DNA sequence: GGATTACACCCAAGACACCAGGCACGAGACAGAAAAACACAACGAAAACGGCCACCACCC
């Protein structure tokens, strides 16, 4: 970030390539690059099913999960979460007023608030609930699969 | 007119003496920096922001 490279053959060529630009610090702060480093400036640079992942988007941010099914297009990956639902207690959400999490129990939703499709698979307000676990189409940008440090609650649960 | 004879001296060999180029070291005043400059108390008053992007949203 903040570093811009221009491939020229003379210093004044770089000067005029960066001249006439207001998005450039007025200083001519330019440094040469070693032969080995030339290719190092253009180097471009772990998502598996059953991989423990966390969410960062919308209301369910910061919730660990399991990647369930990846779409053929390669942009959206299904997740297995522990729902955070209110059972119609205050329906008449964000990432700061959210109550705690708990696996879907069909009995509670039936008693308080529901189209049963298969055994354990419940479609509730556009949400997929398999065996009490939250299923929804999560965009790959919304999820973290690398560098996840499991917490105490995850050891207790996972 | 050259050698030869008779002879004056004097100057180079030999002993012990000297100059200035630069080189190590003082310090030099410049400047340039810092760096601190009363006690106690009372009152009122105002106090971060851009772009971000799911999400609700509207007409299509």
Contact between A62 and A56 under an 8 Å Cβ cutoff? The reply is: yes
Distance in angstroms (rounded) separating the CA atoms of residues A103 and A39: 50
Q: Which sign does the torsion angle of CA A106, A109, A110, A112 carry? A: positive
Nucleotides on strand B with an atom closer than 7 A to protein CB?
A: 54-55
Give the DSSP per-residue string, A29-87: ------HHHHHHTT------TT-EEEE-STTSTT-EEEEEEE-SSSSEEEEEE-----T
Q: What is d(CA A142, CA A138) in angstroms, rounded to the nearest whole number?
A: 7
At a 7 A CB cut-off, the residues bordering strand B are A 57-59, 139, 141-142
User: Resolution limit in angstroms?
Assistant: 4.1
**Short-list A87, A88, A51, CA closest to A67:** A51
Distance (Å, rounded) from C-alpha A61 to C-alpha A69?
Answer: 19
User: Could you tell me the distance in Å between the CA of residue A11 and the C1' of nucleotide B12?
Assistant: 75
Sequence-ordered list of residues with C-beta below 8 angstroms from that of A130, at least 6 positions apart, any chain:
A80, A120, A121, A122
């Amino acid at each position: 970030k903040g570093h811009v490279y221009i491939e020229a053959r003379k210093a004044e060529a770089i000067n005029d390539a960066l001249k006439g630009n207001v998005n450039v610090f007025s200083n001519n702060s330019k440094f040469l690059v070693g032969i080995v480093e030339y290719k190092d400036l253009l180097r471009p640079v772990k998502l598996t099913r059953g991989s423990y992942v966390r969410v960062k988007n919308g209301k369910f941010k910061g919730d660990l999960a399991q990647v369930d099914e990846v779409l053929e297009n390669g942009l959206e990956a299904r997740l297995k979460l522990v729902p955070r639902l209110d059972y119609g207690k205050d329906l008449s959400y964000t990432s700061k007023f959210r109550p705690a999490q708990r696996l879907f129990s069909e009995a509670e939703a039936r008693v308080h608030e529901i189209r049963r499709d298969r055994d354990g698979f419940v479609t509730y307000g556009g949400e997929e609930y398999y065996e009490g676990f939250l299923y929804k189409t999560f965009r790959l940008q919304n999820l973290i699969v690398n560098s996840i440090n499991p917490t105490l609650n995850e050891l207790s649960l996972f």
